[model samples]
Target: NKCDVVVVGGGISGMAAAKLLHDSGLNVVVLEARDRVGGRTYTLRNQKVKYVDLGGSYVGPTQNRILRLAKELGLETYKVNEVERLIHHVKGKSYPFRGPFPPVWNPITYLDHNNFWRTMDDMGREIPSDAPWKAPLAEEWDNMTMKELLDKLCWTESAKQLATLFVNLCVTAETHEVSALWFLWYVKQCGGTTRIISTTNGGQERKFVGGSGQVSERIMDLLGDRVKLERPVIYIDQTRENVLVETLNHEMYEAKYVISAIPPTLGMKIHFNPPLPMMRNQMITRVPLGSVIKCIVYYKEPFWRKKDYCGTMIIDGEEAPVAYTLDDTKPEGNYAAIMGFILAHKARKLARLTKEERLKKLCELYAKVLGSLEALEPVHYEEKNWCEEQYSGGCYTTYFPPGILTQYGRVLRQPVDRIYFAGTETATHWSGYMEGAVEAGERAAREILHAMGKIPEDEIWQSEPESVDVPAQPITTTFLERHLPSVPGLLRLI
Candidate 1:
């Protein structure tokens, strides 16, 4: 009546954990709530036979874990296309911007930038890799919301709006809602704020050849029947020697160890036999996932390219439904595409709108911004609202709110009885990206494997984040020759 490991949630985190434990000679079963394996890494292939990720799908040079997994599994990666310009709307008029901002803005924008960078750079030194509660001023900083901190930083209206936009983009939360300490800790884990937010050399740099979900699809192939679909875990009964888990369908499975590779909000929804500690309970309640709706519209061709547009656009103001967009056209394939993220409160509001309403507005926005109203007609279009997904309450990632980071964050990843945690939210680096999910899963697998005597408690790796590091080899530089993209970069992969 016992197995080595029982993995909960079949997303990247769950599958990654299952793959490691199964290959380590442990009897493992992955219980997934959904019928599919990849949770937030969902990929869709449609009309023109092109693939677009409806969920988390970008990889950067510094993100070593997931990138290495893609290579080992025999998957390929392609660089995101370059941007000629991002159409930035300001006060009812749009203008060209490049590399994160317009060429010229209110001098006050730069003023806000300096204030924020300086404040974070200074406080960032106090933050440690994982245990941010140990940071010097943690208690004081934890008391302040991001809005309160930004209030002290900037005074201009333009600066404040930009400030809110940056927060929404990063943690997918409003500045007034999330904790300042939580914001700093998140930025520190990603090496720094700019590094976390930057598009070119940061988080949204490259993507997988087919799709991000293929990594999980490949993992599922290796796992075979070890993963059960449509089986949502209902309750977990844990004891000193072993544990038993119940699915919604009333099936019970017992294992010596359990890895809960899911979001805390979703995971803690199921009752625990002995009940989790009050701290763990409060942390999940305090932390909120970022709401996001991903939109993709495929065109007959890359028409924007003819107008010297590279498919990046930023819309602002209270009425705009979109936060920002990126060019997703395939170099070798025939279809042209643009992907947009409707984030935070706006996304929450848009979630109420019908699919037809959302699609109609998106086409209208593209028609005006992409420079050709006629060329903007979509051959195919779709929007994936993560908030409405029953199993997933939100998207991208979750963040800590005011007073939570310093007070009860110690138990975020700490195990209870026979259960351990493995999700992107618990990672030491790249906390919200796909890389963090893989790193956390592997770490949990190693933990269970070592407890079961599959891996030695090596002295070197017993204390910290240790994993693969593929030396950077400059994959397909995007902004090639300024005006026109080179087809030559597509042929080579080292």
Candidate 2:
């Protein structure tokens, strides 16, 4: 088969890129490893109720690109009525806090300084709104881990515990595994701490009116024949004239440009003709992806909501079975639905047990929080364990310890020979989110257009690496003073 462009992977990034390129008057062919599309953005229905999103469930107002696309496709968005109070199970008791509590009183307040949000706001001021990643602290902050930054602040024992738990839950990895610099950059991209971005609009969190699957369906509809389902790419060869892709079924396709939208870990499975550079190969082998197991349990009615609960919880002190929970039922009947997420390490440990053993463990955990095991004995349960799947090694992209989110990260996105890279992982501003996936896809399409002399380079945000001087005595005591002023004399203590 011959095409102008061949895109690998049918996830959001791949679909978006294919649609954009095809609309630009190019013949694009998409090869998806899985039997279905949407990649991590998946939804399922049970018991004749509305469909519930099992992956990439949240989007915010700041994600203008995704929101615009949704509107154009005629997809209605509903605000998510998230649980207001957070109940934490620490030691053996549960502590509930409600109604605009201070960060210190919240279970997620490990990174809270008296003016933590203020510091984030100041950091935003320092970053040019147009070039958020080009923030002045990029070079210096990228060199440190989140744990190192917390240590410099001299956080209290309780504070440290809370912060660690939050990181583990958010990134779905251990605290030490994530880079603090990446975390700061992430918060900055989301509009700073004072007004953090969330899935809610007004009092409710936003999602596609029917389900997130609608977003994927609309994109697929726009690119009819360009998308090929269940076509797993086994080999990729970059030659002088064009790039060649061969699927496991012995089908062959050729194109001038090839975009690999698969996650880094799974992207490693495909063989490259000349082989990847040493650093790129090492990155694929070493960097870890967050492991997530999504469980959807259906009940006869909205029991938690009856008690005035919005169906959210956070477990602390190590005895918790699931890291976090969310309410996913709406617009259907009174049938209640809850989503349970378990990180990779914990999920792997649980996978060793039989199905009955795992269910029993989950029941015990629910009993501890909900006050009984009766409500949790569901009519049926559906589980998707991404870590155990061969196509996608993990649920989403998350940086691992010593992983380069700085200069090396930019390098990973550069085109090598005829092969180009596009995925949520390639996004600098909103990496690891659905918005990032769409942004990267649009970016790759523009890059290809520019290469063909169809568009000006300035039309898109593209930058080249230049030597920047490192100021001597770069460690300013004021850096902490500005970001963590309320940490009990942090400057003098450090």
Candidate 3:
């Protein structure tokens, strides 16, 4: 059948693109590989814990498109609790810090920690989110791994560990595996280090009342019969007048334009007629998804809160099983839980273990970090090893190795003939988050819309609405104000 547009991968990005194109009176169809919608945003429903988001979750300040879309969908969001102090467990000692940084016992380590973030934020500021490769230092930065960058800035082992832990937590890949230019550009895309990692005003701020996966499902509902599930597009023949999308089920879709909305790495599976451009092939080949196993432990109660522990812990030990954790309890529900991530090489190693073995090991680590025997006795446990997922490959998102961004970054989003790319990876803002997926989808749809001469050029790039009905965040001291000891301040007149 012929259509105006055929979007591959019915994830948030694909669904979003279909939504815009369909609303514009274009005959659009979405073909998804998975049995369900939402792709990386998956929610596991269990009778014990009710439901848990096994994939991408959370939206915060500046993640406006997702926020607005959720509101429009009649969904509500609740903030993740952060009133209690954060625990920073390093080498064998644990320090409870109030703000973003841990209390560095060594003065030099403290200075290095402060300088690390300051310098990173300064460099990231120079990177334009839309085209990071166009930055002046892109070639130099992209030529080195993030580990090399850390080695240059950090004199103490503690600082290096801290930097590595933060990078692993954010990107779900080892620092040595990622490009410095990509890392800096990614942090800038989300806001800054503070915004990327913090809970109160940062990316992990709030979650949907039901589940984030519902966002894609709801969008699918809007598109209705236009969405076809279990249709893994194996071949994209764009040699003819209309681009033809062929699925594994022997189904075919011919459209004026096509959007590949899956991860760039996933694109390698499809056989492209006439073949993808050499640079495009090179970029996707280098863009490997980061390994991660997202685990959630359900407790009988919020035990850590009673001890004034926020359940947010950052482990900086070499042998640590989990990189970071957060309180996964709902706003007013009896569902109390803690979410942790087994990241990078650790995820690769531990993913070899059985579910029971992984859960037991994680529980033991949780008990050690939270300082509670109760952590060992969770009512239930849930996890999603993205590395094992056939379609997803891995989670959080893909990152560039050294040199790929500088050499092949231009093709990351550039449309190929009647084919365009739309995924969280292609987004300029909040690139790894749901907001990025939505923005990328809409952007791709607009590109097609423009090609069809349906919309003006200026309408293609959108800004956030003047305001969305997002609930006001709690009033508290500014992030900088809370970091007086971390950042030496001038004496003020009383």
Instruction: For residues 1-494, write the lDDT of model 1, one tens digit per residue.
Output: 35789999998888888988887688899999998988888988875646888998888767887877778899777767665666776566778766744543455454455555556756877988678889889988899998988787765666667767778878877898898888888887886766665567667767787788898889989987888889999999985457999999998899999999989888666888788888887677777788889988788887777777778777667777876788877757466888888888988898788987887777787776665785447888767988878777788888888888788788878888778899998888888878888878988888877776767867212232222333333322224222231122222321
User: Which parts of model 1 have CA positions greater than 4 angstroms off?
Assistant: 105-108, 456-494
Q: Superposing all C-alpha atoms, what RMSD in Å does each candidate have to the true structure?
A: 8.0, 6.9, 3.6
lDDT of each: 0.77, 0.67, 0.87
CA error at residue 119 for candidate 3, angstroms: 0.4
lDDT of 2 by residue, 1-494 (tens): 89999999888888888888888899999998887888888877655555777777776545656666667678766555555554556666555555322235532243344444454455556654334346678666667777776666545666556556656655677666666666666556655543233333311146677777777777878888778888999998885487889998889999989888878766678888878877687777766677777776667665766566666666666656576666666755355666678764777777686766666666667657665456557655667777776776677664655436654554557787777788887775556777678777878878888888999988655432211211111112236435554555444576
Q: Kindly provide the TM-score of model 3 when superposed on the true structure, using C-alpha atoms.
A: 0.95
- How many pairs in model 3 have backbone atoms within 3 A of each other, for residues 3 or more apart or on separate chains, i.e. clashes? 0
Q: Per-prediction TM-score, please?
A: 0.90, 0.84, 0.95
- Evaluated against the true structure, the overall lDDT of model 2 is 0.67
TM-score of predicted model 1?
Answer: 0.90
TM-score of 2: 0.84
Q: Which candidate achieves the best lDDT against the true structure?
A: 3
Off by over 4 Å in 2: 46-50, 99-144, 193-204, 372-374, 461-485, 490-494
Question: Worst 10-residue stretch by lDDT in candidate 3?
Answer: 485-494
The RMSD (Cα, Å) of candidate 3 is 3.6
